[PDB]
Amino acid sequence: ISNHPAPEYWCSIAYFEMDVQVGETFKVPSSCPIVTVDGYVDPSGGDRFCLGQLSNVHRTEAIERARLHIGKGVQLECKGEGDVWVRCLSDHAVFVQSYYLDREAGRAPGDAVHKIYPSAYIKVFDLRQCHRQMQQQAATAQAAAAAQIGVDDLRRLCILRMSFVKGWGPDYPRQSIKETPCWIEIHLHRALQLLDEVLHTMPIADPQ
Amino acid sequence: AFWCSIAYYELNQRVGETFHASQPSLTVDGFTDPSNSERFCLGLLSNVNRNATVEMTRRHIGRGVRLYYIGGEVFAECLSDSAIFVQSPNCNQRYGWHPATVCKIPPGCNLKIFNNQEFAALLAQSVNQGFEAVYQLTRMCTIRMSFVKGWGAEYRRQTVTSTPCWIELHLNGPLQWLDKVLTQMGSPSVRCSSMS
Amino acid sequence: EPAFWCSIAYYELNQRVGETFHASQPSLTVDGFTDPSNSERFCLGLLSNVNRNATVEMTRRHIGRGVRLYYIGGEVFAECLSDSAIFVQSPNCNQRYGWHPATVCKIPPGCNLKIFNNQEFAALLAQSVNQGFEAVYQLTRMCTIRMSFVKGWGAEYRRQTVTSTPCWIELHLNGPLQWLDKVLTQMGSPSVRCSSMS
């Protein structure tokens, strides 16, 4: 899709526990195509991001419980320049939020929660589809700007959210992912690099 | 070797990881490049509890501000199409107004936000004043900047924590010199108890 | 053996302040001064907190030379370089003397204390393979130690929680955690399933 140098990290993982980020962001080098986010406790980074070794003063009785079940958690693999795949190695399910998956289901952006089954190996992100969809937004703006969508709206296209154990959505007591006892937000770097490029082509000309 | 670290805030919420500047001239913008030792891109920093105003203001950060280390001085050039407000106790104390003074930097402008020699001289005469006087100089090693919205004297946003998007700069150079003095200032006057 | 034998997190009441510090040398001091680039010093004096109140701002003035942490052999010691006592809560130590795991030990200025012992922990990790996943997972608390500057907490004081103290840190012993991990990745899983709704 692009020619400029590949990113140092192919993604960033931020663990959460409700509306609070617990622990510090995990950066996965591009040299580590597959990363594991389990509920175990090995501090050494590398290919494993152990959520079980993250502390939190706010942590409750209900979260200590859920965290106990993360297990081998899942895996995040980078295949083609910016394509991500997920494989649930956990005994429990995992809930993923993906536009590539929403589109594939004929659903509207963000109007669906995808439950992955243990042992499942599904594709959750297509760099090209992302890149396309960006210019898609940049175009209509250049238009709605001359006829008369921000960085936070479109950066979502380069983001992935995943809740371990508990699920949210329109069929669970939890309405938003900021209500699950433990989850993570993944930022795809390549998708962001392409976005940095696209952002420069949205003639500021927005007016104040 | 980093001459300064930068922390981004949204109101009174610390958002994102601390950026460490390794390049003598960098930029803090509202874009999304995740790996530029010369670009602290705020656009890629999330905030699960981000409101509309913040989100709206982030849109106008644009090319943001360009900070840059010429010799022993730091300059801030507003690249954004919106103004950027600076609160530099080292810059204010130069023009004279109450250190908490915020100075507006219109688009296309640039201000000298810090001067080493000045600081060093202020650190020297402080030693005679006492521990307390030296301990407070850490504020002199800090600089706060807001994007798009202003604050302080008569912008009815009296404190930085009121602005939607602001950033704090810690000058490592000055902090290191302060530390060398501090470890020699002895002990505080005013004491304290373990129970109170 | 890990690059950093431990990681330290600074807190002001119930809030995380500053970045996480990773110790590479066998010696490091957590003081209240301002050097930002010393692999042997975790200077809290430069850390800023917009929501900082008066009491924290006052206690930060008495951290002084702070605490010195040692990693000699397979043990860890905490020395009080501050002219004010420090208060530690190390389960590993507390058990060694038979005190409620949540015991807070006071280290007067100039004094020191063996805060952790690897062989002791390794042994506890062993005789646990007999109690199940649950038992092992909880051995992570053994890998964490909390210290408070100037103000004490727990019994004997009015502040009953470490989150009530103005300035405190939390250490994670990477070595122990690593050894624990190896035994966890094999302890199977918990018996009491977890609903996806409860």
Full set of structural domains in chain B with CATH: 1-195 (2.60.200.10)
Method: X-ray
- Given a contact cutoff of 8 angstroms between Cβ atoms, the answer to whether B80 and B147 are in contact is yes
Type of residue at C53:
N
Give the separation between CA B169 and CA B13, rounded to whole angstroms: 16
Give the contacts of A37 (CB within 8 A, at least 6 positions apart): A13, A26, A48, A49, A51, A73, A74, A75, A76, A184
- Given a contact cutoff of 8 angstroms between Cβ atoms, the answer to whether A68 and A105 are in contact is no
Q: Which residues pair with A34 in a beta bridge?
A: A77
List % helix, strand, coil for chain A (3-state, nearest 5): 30, 25, 50
All domains of chain A in start order, with CATH: 1-208 (2.60.200.10)
Return the closest-CA partner of residue C68 out of C107, C121, C119: C107
- Per CB-CB distance under 8 Å, the chain A contacts of B32 are 151, 155, 158, 192-193, 195-196, 199
- Per CB-CB distance under 8 Å, the chain A contacts of C19 are 24
Return the closest-CA partner of residue C19 out of C35, C43, C2, C38: C43
Q: Residues of B129-139 as b/e, b for ≥16 C-beta within 10 angstroms? A: eebeebbebbe
Q: Chain C: nearest CA to A178, how far in angstroms? A: 14
- Given a contact cutoff of 8 angstroms between Cβ atoms, the answer to whether A208 and B82 are in contact is yes
User: Is the Cβ pair A69, C194 closer than 8 Å?
Assistant: yes
- Per CB-CB distance under 8 Å, the chain B contacts of C37 are 1-2, 172, 176
Which helix (H) or strand (E) covers residue B30, if one does? none
Return the closest-CA partner of residue B54 out of B66, B63, B67, B45: B45
3-state SS, residue B96: coil
User: Is the Cβ pair A91, C189 closer than 8 Å?
Assistant: yes
User: Is the Cβ pair C33, B183 closer than 8 Å?
Assistant: yes
The breaks in chain C (C to N more than 2.5 Å) occur after none
Give the separation between CA A197 and CA C7, rounded to whole angstroms: 37
The residue with tokens 């980093």 is: B2
**A 152-171 near C (Cβ less than 8 A):** 165-167
Q: Measured between CB atoms, does C100 come within 8 Å of chain B?
A: no
Give the separation between CA A94 and CA A4, rounded to whole angstroms: 34
Return the closest-CA partner of residue C79 out of C94, C91, C64: C64
User: Is the Cβ pair C48, B7 closer than 8 Å?
Assistant: yes
Return the closest-CA partner of residue A10 out of A208, A150, A191: A191
Q: Which residues pair with B96 in a beta bridge?
A: none
Give the contacts of A156 (CB within 8 A, at least 6 positions apart): A99, A110
Query: Would you give the end-to-end CA distance of chain B in angstroms?
Result: 40
Give the separation between CA B146 and CA B168, rounded to whole angstroms: 9
Give the separation between CA C39 and CA C24, rounded to whole angstroms: 7
User: Sheet of A159-164: strands edge to edge?
Assistant: A26-29, A9-16, A183-187, A159-164, A94-97, A114-116
Q: Which residues pair with B25 in a beta bridge?
A: B68
User: Is the Cβ pair B43, A151 closer than 8 Å?
Assistant: yes
Give the separation between CA A85 and CA A160, rounded to whole angstroms: 11
Strands C27-30 and C75-80, how do they pair?
unpaired
How far CA A172 is from CA of A167, B69, B75, in Å, comes to 7, 53, 52
